[PDB]
């Protein structure tokens, strides 16, 4: 119930389509739900996620960005204390996997 | 006996005791390259007073 | 009550932690869409599929540019 | 094999091998490459891994 | 790499203990950490260095 309203709002937000009576809204929504129901991925591996987080930290320490490394460790360790964790992490990871390296001024 | 235990650590260099009578505290729980840095540490209570600190540190 | 507001406080705290995660990782996500996807994840939804849809709708709004 | 590096010891040549960085897709093709000289021998006791990391940082500069 | 190489080369080539070899490596690396702009204090200098690297790739365009 809330799930459906959420998929509507996700279409509105990311796609920039604020009018549900646009046919493009319904097409994007049908696309979104058909993508959700096309089960084609393995379930999230928490250990692989953990490895990726740790490696991100190592890349920060290698590039002498210590404020970013300290922030990265601190934020990830706090977030991992109270499955869905690793889910959201992988989500963000894939989402913009470009390089995204500068992002300074904590 | 103390002087026997010293030459068990110079001419032997393998320490093995079930009682604390020597000034080295070996760690037989792991090490393979951290052996040098951590496996043997100074027990600071079984140094006698006819052995100065310099002597004990160097024998370790 | 009081303990029903303390939970809403700690939840927003963890969401703020993730909001700082999003800016230092230089991810394009905002507070609103993540507030959408959390309530999505409460029923359980695969983040691979969430990422696969957001990568398309983000590429449908550079097409409106 | 082409240059003067060839004559040098097989030990150190064996210990020199490539590594790569993370987050590769978004082009940044110049950030991705690295040299990691790996140490696992008895001499790891004198060439500790936290200084191996430092060598990578100075390589990067 | 000529001052620091000389410092390292002395305190290894004499060194009568393996620990002196070790404590020679440590300081030689940390001196290089200080001479390069890699400290928790010299961030501000490095920041300007990145902007002096930016205009090089800009001019190419």
> How far apart are alpha carbons E61 and E55 in whole angstroms?
10
> How far apart are alpha carbons C27 and E1 in whole angstroms?
40
Helix H or strand E segment including D52: helix D49-60
**Kindly report the CA angle at B11 between B8 and B17, in degrees rounded to 5?**
20
Q: Could you give the angle at which helices C47-61 and C31-43 cross, rounded to 10 degrees?
A: 150
> How far apart are alpha carbons A2 and C40 in whole angstroms?
8
Q: Does A101 contact chain D (CB < 8 Å)?
A: yes
> How far apart are alpha carbons B30 and B35 in whole angstroms?
8
In chain D, the N- to C-terminal Cα span, in Å, equals: 26
**Kindly report the CA angle at A100 between A71 and A31, in degrees rounded to 5?**
115
Other Cβ atoms less than 10 A from the Cβ of A86: the count is: 20
Residue E29 has its nearest CB partner, among D46, D54, D61, at D54
Helix H or strand E segment including A67: helix A66-79
**Kindly report the CA angle at C59 between C57 and C61, in degrees rounded to 5?**
75
> How far apart are alpha carbons A92 and C14 in whole angstroms?
16
Residue E6 burial (C-beta neighbours within 10 Å; 0-12, 13-18, 19+) = exposed
The residue whose two tokens read 């509507």 is: A8
**Number of Cβ pairs < 8 A linking chain B and chain D:** 6
CB contact under 8 A, D42 and B35: no
In the stretch 11-40 of chain A, residues with CB closer than 8 A to chain D read: none
DSSP-based three-state secondary structure for A4: helix
- Which residues on chain E are in Cβ contact (under 8 Å) with A64? 38, 46
Subunits adjacent to chain B (3 or more Cβ pairs under 8 Å)? D
> How far apart are alpha carbons D46 and E22 in whole angstroms?
6
* Exposed e or buried b per residue across C1-37, where buried means at least 16 C-beta atoms within 10 angstroms of its C-beta: eeeeeeeeeeeeeeeeebeebbebbebebeeebbebb
Q: How was this structure determined?
A: cryo-EM
Q: Could you give the angle at which helices E3-13 and E18-35 cross, rounded to 10 degrees?
A: 170
Residue D57 has its nearest CB partner, among E21, E26, E38, at E38
Other Cβ atoms less than 10 A from the Cβ of D57: the count is: 16
D18 strand-pairing partners: D35
Three-state secondary structure string covering chain E: CCHHHHHHHHHHHCCCCHHHHHHHHHHHHHHHHHHCCCCCCCHHHHHHHHHHHHHHHHHHC
Nearest CA to C57 among A14, E33, A57, D4? A14
> How far apart are alpha carbons A61 and A72 in whole angstroms?
10
Tokens representing residue E52 in the block: 């002096």
Q: E52 phi and psi, to 5 degrees?
A: -80, -20
Tokens representing residue C26 in the block: 């230089």
Tokens representing residue D1 in the block: 């094999």
**Kindly report the CA angle at D45 between D44 and D47, in degrees rounded to 5?**
55
Cα B17 vs. chain centroid, distance in angstroms? 10
Resolution in A: 8.1
> How far apart are alpha carbons A64 and E23 in whole angstroms?
23
The residue whose two tokens read 């869905």 is: A84
Cα A102 vs. chain centroid, distance in angstroms? 18
Q: Does A61 contact chain D (CB < 8 Å)?
A: yes
DSSP-based three-state secondary structure for A30: helix
* Exposed e or buried b per residue across D3-40, where buried means at least 16 C-beta atoms within 10 angstroms of its C-beta: eeeeeeeeeeeebeeeeebbbeeeeeeebeeeebeebe
Task: Tell me how far CA of residue C51 lies from CA of A30, A41, C56, in angstroms.
Answer: 16, 12, 9
E12 with D46: CB under 8 angstroms? no
Q: Does A35 contact chain E (CB < 8 Å)?
A: no
In chain A, the N- to C-terminal Cα span, in Å, equals: 38
Chain D nearest-CA distance from B32, in A, is 9
């Amino acid at each position: 119930a809330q799930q459906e309203r959420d998929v509507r709002e996700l279409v509105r937000g990311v796609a920039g389509l604020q009018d549900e009576a646009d046919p493009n809204f319904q097409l994007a929504l049908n696309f979104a739900w058909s993508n959700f129901r096309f089960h084609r991925f393995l379930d999230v591996n928490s250990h692989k996620i953990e490895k990726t987080i740790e490696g991100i930290y190592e890349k920060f320490v290698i590039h002498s960005d210590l404020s970013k490394a300290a922030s990265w460790k601190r934020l990830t360790e706090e977030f991992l204390n109270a499955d869905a964790h690793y889910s959201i992490l992988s989500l963000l990871l894939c989402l913009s996997d470009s390089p995204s390296n500068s992002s300074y001024v904590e | 006996p103390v002087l026997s235990f010293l030459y068990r650590w110079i001419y032997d260099g393998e320490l093995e005791d079930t009682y604390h009578e020597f000034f080295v505290a070996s760690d037989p729980t792991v090490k393979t390259d951290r052996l040098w840095h951590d496996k043997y540490t100074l027990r600071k209570s079984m140094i006698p007073s006819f052995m100065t600190m310099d002597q004990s540190r160097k024998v370790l | 009550a009081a303990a029903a507001a303390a939970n809403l406080n700690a939840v927003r705290e963890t969401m703020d932690v993730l909001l700082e995660i999003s800016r230092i990782l230089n991810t394009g996500l905002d507070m609103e869409t993540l507030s959408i996807c959390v309530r999505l994840c409460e029923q359980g939804i695969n983040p691979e599929a969430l990422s696969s849809v957001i990568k398309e709708l983000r590429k449908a709004t550079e097409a409106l540019k | 094999r082409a240059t003067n590096a060839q004559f040098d010891s097989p030990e150190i040549l064996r210990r020199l091998d490539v590594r790569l960085l993370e987050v590769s897709p978004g082009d940044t093709g110049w950030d991705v490459f690295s040299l990691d000289y790996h140490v696992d021998g008895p001499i790891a006791t004198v060439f500790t891994r936290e200084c191996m990391s430092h060598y990578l940082r100075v390589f990067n500069f | 790499l000529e001052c620091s190489w000389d410092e390292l080369w002395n305190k290894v080539q004499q060194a009568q203990d393996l620990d002196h070899i070790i404590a020679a490596h440590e300081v030689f690396l940390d001196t290089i950490i200080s001479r390069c702009l890699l400290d928790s204090d010299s961030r501000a200098l490095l920041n300007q260095l990145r902007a002096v690297f930016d205009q090089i790739i800009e001019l190419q365009n």
